[PDB]
Amino acid sequence: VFTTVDNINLHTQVVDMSMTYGQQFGPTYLDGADVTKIKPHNSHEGKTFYVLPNDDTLRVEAFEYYHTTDPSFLGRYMSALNHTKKWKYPQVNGLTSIKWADNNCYLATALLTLQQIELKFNPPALQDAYYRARAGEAANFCALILAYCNKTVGELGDVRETMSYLFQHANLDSCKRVLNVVCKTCGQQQTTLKGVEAVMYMGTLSYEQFKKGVQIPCTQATKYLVQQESPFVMMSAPPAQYELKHGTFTCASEYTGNYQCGHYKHITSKETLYCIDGALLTKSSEYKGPITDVFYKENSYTTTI
């Protein structure tokens, strides 16, 4: 048979029918199911298998595809895939969603959001699954998202936290946010953020109000945006009522329920406002509801006065 870790480079070996896979290879998975305890059925010859890296060439191949040396990563990924490959991934309004199952509401909103913003992932396994997800096959993408966030199937997830984990594995080096806070006592201090901190802010959902001025305490001073060089901006705030106006944003995440046990729903702005709840779709002209994250498009911004 064949054993690999990246599925790009394969290594051919043979198995004895009377010895279980673990003694010959180590922890071995097939199609997301652990075949370590299973003895070789001999029904499949030449089939590709996933093994935890043992050699040094395997360890190096594993990092070049995943960008991690954690030995637990492969196991956490294969156990997530075992669930995600039986989920349904319908296509709603030209976007790939997820039929609700095992509290994946936060995963679906993230998947729909990632298909609407410009992003490039540094780990090749993430980028390759990102492409496959856009086409309509996102089982490996959702499993990798769980493994990189160290989350499990059924576990309760927050969209803002999931996006920030994903942003740290993406090339946001070109992004830049220049801030300036002014206090009548301390004066004026100019700070310059870069990377994940340049595309995310917690406090308001309104990109305008962030450009206008938000009130943060000083050692209350006012914080306003001065320059933004990012393909997008994520505006996060604790869940509250908000009126989404058609054409003033890209997409938003709605959270309705109690802390940690509420349900996420996704709103996107097209020719009208659309609401995606897994496999369901809802259309309206304007939206008002509990909103916690709003995504805006951007290329370059420079403050005036």
Ligand X SMILES: Cc1ccc(OCCN(C)C)cc1C(=O)N[C@H](C)c1cc(-c2cnn(C)c2)cc(-c2cnn(C(F)F)c2)c1
**Closer residue to Cl ion (CB): 49 or 73:** 73
Choose, from 105, 149, 175, 251, the residue flagged as catalytic: 105
- Between 36 and 164, name the residue whose CB sits nearer to ligand X: 164
122 binds Cl ion (CB under 5 A): yes
| Residue 102, binding choice from ligand X, Zn ion, Cl ion, none, Cβ under 5 to 8 Å by partner class | Zn ion
Residue 277 CB neighbour total at 10 angstroms: 18
By CB under 5 A, which span of 8-16, 22-30, 88-96, 205-213 interacts with Zn ion? 8-16
Site for Cl ion in 244-273 (CB under 5 A): 250
227 near Cl ion (CB under 5 A) = no
Encoded tokens for 288: 């008002």
| Span near Zn ion by CB under 5 A; candidates 96-104, 231-239, 265-273, 276-284 | 96-104
The interface partner of residue 158, options being Zn ion, Cl ion, ligand X, none and the CB cut-off 5 to 8 Å by kind, is ligand X
User: For residue 55, what are its two tokens?
Assistant: 């050699």
Alpha carbon of 295 to those of 2, 135, 199, 210: distances in Å?
44, 22, 10, 13
For residues 225 and 219, give the distance between their C-alpha atoms in angstroms, rounded to a whole number.
Answer: 20
- Is 263 a catalytic site residue? yes
Smallest distance, ligand X to C-beta of residue 113, A? 14
Q: Is 158 in the site for ligand X (CB under 6 A)?
A: yes
Tell me the longest C-alpha to C-alpha distance in the chain. 80
Nearest to 157 by CA among 203, 111, 93: 111
The answer to whether 183 is annotated as binding is yes
Given 39, 59, 67, 263, the residue binding Cl ion (CB under 5 A) = 67
Q: Which of residues 244-283 bind ligand X (CB under 6 A)?
A: 255, 258-260, 262
Least distance in angstroms from the C-beta of 234 to ligand X: 13
Which of 6, 128, 158, 277 is the catalytic position?
277
277 is catalytic: yes
Least separation in angstroms between residue 108's CB and ligand X is 13
The amino acid sitting at 47 is K
Which one of 2-10, 21-29, 66-74, 157-165 is the stretch in contact with ligand X (CB under 6 A)? 157-165
Binding-site entries for Zn(2+):
183, 186, 218
Which residues would be at the binding site for ligand X (CB under 6 A)? 156-158, 161, 202, 238-239, 255, 258-260, 262, 292
Which residues would be at the binding site for Zn ion (CB under 5 A)? 9, 67, 83, 102-103, 105, 122, 183, 185-186, 218, 263
Active site residues: 105, 263, 277
Binding-site entries:
183, 186, 218
